[PDB]
Design a protein around this ligand. Structure first.
Ligand SMILES: C=C(C)CCSP(=O)(O)OP(=O)(O)O
Ligand SMILES: C=C(C)CCSP(=O)(O)OP(=O)(O)O
Ligand SMILES: [Mg+2]
Ligand SMILES: [Mg+2]
Lengths: 236, 236
């Protein structure tokens, strides 16, 4: 229904603050966060959103402690193995993709991604992108490299490079809705932290102080209601 | 002083809402807005900010009425002819540059830019960038084209393309602070509207409901105070 975004993206944050707050391990913060994802993806599907992207891991995040990063990777494998398998085989019929530098991930996580993508390859329901080892600068540079390789091999001239060409070489080339209509960021910070950059020229931003382990279906609804109250003029 | 941003950027907005609100012409809205710029640039200089960017005109804005756009162009000529001439010849010793697709502008505005840039070429004070006919997508594509031309002529291989190389071909290559530390947007909308994109992976965003004709030195101070209260973790 028109006032329903095609693409919603979410930046998860606030997991350690939440753990600190509740006297509990950061790992428990992360696990309680990841447990919210399935209800959010269900909700977005019911609402008629066409693509939901959840950003789970930036390149910068690899500079955290080894054990924190390894626990995240394991939780994501588990998420892809249970929750995602349930979503793509439900009547929601979700299509699953992962975007990012998947070569940086543990082989097991790469395999779990392959499995979930293969299992959902023919599905026709809402697309769900898990962005993992995904950074917006890195996307742009890698697009630039792919375009330059084509120029090197004669397939493309420099003056042929336009928005649309640049767009077809990003990691979001797997969707016809690469640009989010609505970007949600949990935990109160007002910054992109090297998420999408090319993708965001007209995206509506919604920032909630809610820490992501507390973030549920009602918080998605709240962001959507803010969205419907926005006037989008696109410069003109 | 450390907690002072090197680069502050401002998105001006809310001029027609302000005019509507006060029963006055949109053109008067725009002129009252542009009259605020000099006190903002002075203030940023006093505060030890190293670069202040004011975004005045996007490519999208060219889809407004002819007369609105022509009035903006004339006001900008006048700003560059009086206010900017005063700033660069004051003891603030401001260095003036314009960024954007300057070929799309009226020759007279192009000449006014040339004059102010030439007059300030040797200055050592705060840099002031006026971004005019500047769009973030357009920046990235034009960088991509310049890099591809170099690849075509053998100066660069595709695997040589890294962040830093990509950065030296954007329109912000004129500063050593291309990425704003703090981005201010007046008038209550929470979106970039095709301003900087590459430039913004870690920029702090500050959104004020104040309509830009009401925006003064205290509103800069308020954004700076919010800035100093932000915790910046850069992913790690
Ligand atoms: C081009 C600028 C100086 C500011 C961008 S705000 P503008 O009104 O042009 O664009 P939208 O609010 O997205 O409609
Ligand atoms: C990588 C994400 C899933 C979210 C970005 S929030 P993160 O805490 O990683 O980064 P900062 O707040 O800028 O320190
Ligand atoms: Mg965080
Ligand atoms: Mg506006």
């Amino acid at each position: 229904d028109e006032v329903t975004p095609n693409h919603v993206a979410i930046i998860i944050d606030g997991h350690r603050k939440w753990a600190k707050s509740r006297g509990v391990t950061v790992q428990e913060g992360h696990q309680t966060g990841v447990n919210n994802w399935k209800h959010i993806i269900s909700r977005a599907s019911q609402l008629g959103i066409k693509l939901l992207t959840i950003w789970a891991l930036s390149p910068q995040n690899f500079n955290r402690s080894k054990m924190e990063v390894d626990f995240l990777m394991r939780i994501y494998e588990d998420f892809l193995r249970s929750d995602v398998k349930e979503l793509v085989t439900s009547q929601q019929d979700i299509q699953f993709s992962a975007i990012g530098d998947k070569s940086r991930l543990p082989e097991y996580l790469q395999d779990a991604i392959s499995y979930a993508e293969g299992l959902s390859q023919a599905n026709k329901g809402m697309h769900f992108i898990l962005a993992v080892a995904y950074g917006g600068r890195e996307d742009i540079v890698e697009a630039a490299r792919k375009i330059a390789a084509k120029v090197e091999h004669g397939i493309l001239r420099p003056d042929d490079i336009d928005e649309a060409t640049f767009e077809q070489h990003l990691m979001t080339n797997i969707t016809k809705f690469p640009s989010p209509d609505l970007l949600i960021r949990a935990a109160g910070e007002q910054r992109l932290s090297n998420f999408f950059l090319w993708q965001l020229p007209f995206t509506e931003f919604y920032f909630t102080p809610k820490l992501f382990p507390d973030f549920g279906e009602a918080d998605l609804l709240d962001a959507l209601a803010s969205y419907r109250c926005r006037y989008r003029g696109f410069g003109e």
